[PDB]
Amino acid sequence: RENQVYSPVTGARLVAGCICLTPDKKQVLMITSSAHKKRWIVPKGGVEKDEPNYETTAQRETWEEAGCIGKIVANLGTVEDMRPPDIKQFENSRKDSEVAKHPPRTEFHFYELEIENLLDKFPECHKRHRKLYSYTEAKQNLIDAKRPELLEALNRSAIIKDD
Numbered sequence: 112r113e114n115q116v117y118s119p120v121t122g123a124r125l126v127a128g129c130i131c132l133t134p135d136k137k138q139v140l141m142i143t144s145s146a147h148k149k150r151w152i153v154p155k156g157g158v159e160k161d162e163p164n165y166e167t168t169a170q171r172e173t174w175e176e177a178g179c180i181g182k183i184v185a186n187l188g189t190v191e192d193m194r195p196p197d198i199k200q201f202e203n204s205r206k207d208s209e210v211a212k213h214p215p216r217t218e219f220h221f222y223e224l225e226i227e228n229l230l231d232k233f234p235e236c237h238k239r240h241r242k243l244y245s246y247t248e249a250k251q252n253l254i255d256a257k258r259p260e261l262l263e264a265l266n267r268s269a270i271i272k273d274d
């Protein structure tokens with residue numbers, strides 16, 4: 112709906128979410144996408160006009176999409192969805208190549224959460240799957256999902272990478 116908030120600069124959709132970790136920090140909670148039911152992503156969603164901070168949105172989305180409750184233990188900062196929207200799709204340099212200039216689709220504000228509880232019933236528990244994954248499994252899931260920005264957020268978290 113038109114509750115959604117956008118960057119006044121880039122027009123990017125403002126989204127907040129959580130990298131939800133086990134207390135031992137060996138695993139991260141992932142959910143299946145609403146649009147692409149095969150892809151494993153992390154809980155996140157559009158900030159709404161009434162929400163006073165990104166943490167509110169992140170914990171609301173973590174509950175709604177993953178039935179996950181916990182405490183925010185770190186600000187993981189921002190990442191951008193840099194996915195393009197058929198004239199000149201690339202702007203090559205002399206020792207490198209890039210996709211043609213465009214604004215970000217989405218500006219993501221991520222928090223690290225320590226999981227305190229996982230509930231069986233939650234708003235989207237019939238529309239999504241949710242599962243804990245080690246770093247290596249999570250990394251592969253977010254590459255498979257084509258979401259390097261979500262992996263960047265995971266890499267900033269305290270998740271144990273030495274598997």
Ligand SMILES: O=P(O)(O)CP(=O)(O)O[C@@H]1[C@@H](OP(=O)(O)O)[C@H](OP(=O)(O)CP(=O)(O)O)[C@H](OP(=O)(O)O)[C@H](OP(=O)(O)O)[C@H]1OP(=O)(O)O
Nearest residue numbers: 112126143144145146147150152154155156157172176217
């Ligand atoms: O209807 P349109 O084609 O104009 C937009 P689309 O539905 O394809 O966008 C969805 C979005 O659904 P919507 O905002 O409720 O319409 C999802 O929103 P939901 O999770 O269904 C509801 P939310 O906005 O999170 O409260 C989630 O967007 P996001 O808000 O989680 O970033 C998806 O992202 P993802 O599941 O692929 O990661 C994102 O798909 P994407 O644009 O990434 O292909």
Ligand SMILES: [Mg+2]
Nearest residue numbers: 155156157176
């Ligand atoms: Mg979402």
